Amino acid sequence: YKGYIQLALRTGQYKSINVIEVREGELLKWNRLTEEIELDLDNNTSEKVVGYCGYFQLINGFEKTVYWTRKEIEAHKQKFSKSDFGWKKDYDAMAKKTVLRNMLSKWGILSI
Amino acid sequence: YKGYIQLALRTGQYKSINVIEVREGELLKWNRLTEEIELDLDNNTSEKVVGYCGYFQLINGFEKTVYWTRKEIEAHKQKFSKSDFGWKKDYDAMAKKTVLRNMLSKWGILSI
Amino acid sequence: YKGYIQLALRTGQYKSINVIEVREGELLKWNRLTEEIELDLDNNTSEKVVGYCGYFQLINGFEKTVYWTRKEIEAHKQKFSKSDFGWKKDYDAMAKKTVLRNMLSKWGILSI
Amino acid sequence: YKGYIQLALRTGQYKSINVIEVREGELLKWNRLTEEIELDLDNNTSEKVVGYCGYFQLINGFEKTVYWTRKEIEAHKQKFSKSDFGWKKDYDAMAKKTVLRNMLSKWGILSI
Amino acid sequence: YKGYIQLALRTGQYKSINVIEVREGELLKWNRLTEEIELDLDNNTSEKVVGYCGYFQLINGFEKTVYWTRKEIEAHKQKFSKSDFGWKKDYDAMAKKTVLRNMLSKWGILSI
Amino acid sequence: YKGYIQLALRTGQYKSINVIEVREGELLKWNRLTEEIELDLDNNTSEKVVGYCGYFQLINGFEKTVYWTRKEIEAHKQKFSKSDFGWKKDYDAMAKKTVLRNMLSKWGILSI
Amino acid sequence: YKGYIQLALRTGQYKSINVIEVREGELLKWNRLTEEIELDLDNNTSEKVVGYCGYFQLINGFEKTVYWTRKEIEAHKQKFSKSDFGWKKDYDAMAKKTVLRNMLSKWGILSI
Amino acid sequence: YKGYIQLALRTGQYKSINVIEVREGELLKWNRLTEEIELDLDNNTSEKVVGYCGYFQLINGFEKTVYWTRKEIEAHKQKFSKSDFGWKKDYDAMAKKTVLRNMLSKWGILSI
């Protein structure tokens, strides 16, 4: 993936990129059609995360939002992944790296 | 198709683009004349997709919606497609790429 | 025609445009004076198209409907068209492109 | 005339406009006082047109009907028109353009 | 007068308006008290007009009829009009415009 | 008075209204009790008017007739009117407007 | 009283109503039993009114006549009326309005 | 009683109805068998009424006369009436209303 981030930095036409995790009872409602999402901070009771989100905006004003839950990531690990040694040590880091690599791959522009 | 996406990004006058899949018992009703579509989320029982949809809106306020079902895609694969090795591995990805290439081709503006 | 679509997009005062085909036993009744048309979906028995229709609405609320049958298109191809190589490969695409070019030409506004 | 259509489109308070030709044995009866007209379709025997008609309705519900025959148009061409090169090539297009320009002129509202 | 027509259109509570000319041997009998008028079409021999008429009906069902002859118009031109350059070019158009302006003025409702 | 006519039009329950002038040797006999009046047209010799009349009929069949002569109008101008600049320019128009305002006032129904 | 006239108009079953004043030396003889009254016009010498009369006839043929003199009206003003500011300005209008209100009240039919 | 008058008006087959009071030294002679009554007007000296009378005639020519004196009305008030507050304010109005109600009741035809 580090090659993908290297190419993204060498491209030099992006403005901002961010990936975060949304924990139980944090957001209000998400739309899968118009990409409408709203979130309220410091109002929560649990300590277990429920999903992941990512926001990427370019210098020309174009923006993109992606949101995933546990069902898709478990389906992906059970049909594509073939390693399990790192899954016991941590649960989120490899999920984040997969999210980044896919979002950079199928939408992101690459330059050499 | 990646050339088409490259040209679309280099054009730099679009605002948002999205392509999704609509699964059984998700939308309410679709109009083929006025492009009127409404969808209700998290209310569904099955696990088999039934159609595909796409929404593309420009920076000037112009928007366009496209919706396809299985009949048109199977007709297209039986009259135009000549390869079948990838159809057994996955069923949706190539359908999505065909949808994108056609929608970019016959409506989308291109620049060099 | 692609120049006409390019000029239409560069104009930037339209709201929605659509062109479709009406197949046998689909619509109910059409008025050629008040442009009154009503259509009932998923109630049909045949597989042969009978006409073409187009709806174009602007951002100011103005709308326009056009509907053509096979008689006018065959008269047009027999008095104006001088090529026949593409007519055997497909039957509808060039009819649609002629409909678009005429409707953009004699009503549509153009800007440079 | 194209300037008149441009001003009409830039006005942005109209709803629908249409101009057609009525051919022999098509309509039933026309009233010149109350603007009462009724027409029956697909019941005709000849192939020679006999008159022209136009219907224009605004967004506020106001509507207007105009109907002309060959006598008025021949009187107009013999007292006002000074050119004849285009009359041999076609017979109806310039009659339609005169109908549009007059109806837009003496009733239609114009804005700058 | 065009200002009067502009105000009438901007009012937006009228239904139909018409002004015509009645030529010799066209109508049957007219009543100046109950506004009873009846006319028979395509039964006439002369080619010289004898009077003018106007019918104006609102959206609420109210209707009004006005009919004038040559005596009143010649009295009006000889006591009020002060120009004669346009009278030789045409005879009816200015009579019609005076009829419209008076009927809009003394009965018609105006809004700003 | 124009406000009175505006209110009358906005009321929307009237059927017909008319005000005319009766000139010397025109009517036959008038009744002030049963409102019986009969008039014969195109049989007259003089050119000086002698009285004014008005007929107003509603949509429910109710009708009303009013007839005035010069004595009442001269008494009214000498006891109520305080202006004389317009009396020399014309003699009938202000008499008609007074007739309309009084008849609308003391019988006519008003709505807001 | 205007409410009484409003209710009378909204009733919509009357045919004609009239109230007049009879001046000295105008009528011939009046009967208080059979309501027989006869009057001769344009034969009079004085200029002082002596009484008031009213005729009201329905659509079904029923008619009613009422006639009053100065004695009854002065008795009524001295036993019922409590205001005198308007009596000096005019003498007849309030007498007429009292006649109308009483005749509408004790005979007239009212509807809501 | 107003209900009785309402029903009488809704019946719509009457022609004339009248009720009056006969004062001392007014009539000549009355017959209780053949209903023969004759009265001479404007020949009287007193100012105290002595009786009441009523005449009612239909559209078919049928007529009826009723005449009452003070003896019958005082007998009726002393055997039937149970209220006395209104008798001091006026003496005749309630007598008239009783006459009307009885005459409408025992002879008059009623319809619903």
Residue numbers in the entry:
A (entry chain J), B (entry chain I), C (entry chain H), D (entry chain G), E (entry chain F), F (entry chain E), ...: 110 to 221
List sentences from the manuscript.
Some bacteriophage encode a recombinase that catalyzes single-stranded DNA annealing (SSA). Redβ belongs to a large group of proteins annotated as the RecT family based on the protein from the rac prophage of E. coli. Here, we have used single-particle cryo-EM to determine a 3.4 Å structure of a homolog of λ-Redβ from the A118 prophage of Listeria innocua that we will refer to as LiRecT. The structure confirms that the RecT/Redβ family of annealing proteins share a common core fold with RAD52.
To determine if there is a similar structural transition for LiRecT, we prepared a complex of it with just one 83-mer ssDNA and obtained a ~5 Å resolution cryo-EM reconstruction by single particle analysis. Surprisingly, the LiRecT-ssDNA complex also exists as left-handed helical filaments, instead of as rings, but they are not as well ordered, and they do not stack end-to-end. Using a monomer of LiRecT from the complex with annealed duplex, 8 subunits of LiRecT could be docked into the reconstruction for the central portion of the filament. Due to the lower resolution of this reconstruction, we could not fit the ssDNA to the map, although there is strong density for DNA in the groove above α2 and α3. Strikingly, the density for the portion of each LiRecT subunit at the upper rim of the filament is almost completely absent in the structure with ssDNA, for the entire length of the filament. This upper N-terminal lobe of each monomer (N-lobe), which is formed by the αA–αC bundle and the β1–β2 hairpin, would likely clamp down on the DNA once the second strand is incorporated, to form the additional protein-DNA and inter-subunit interactions that are shown in Fig. 4 for the complex with annealed duplex. Moreover, cryo-EM images collected for LiRecT protein without DNA reveal smaller particles that are much less well ordered, suggesting that the filament is assembled on the ssDNA (a full data set without DNA was not collected).
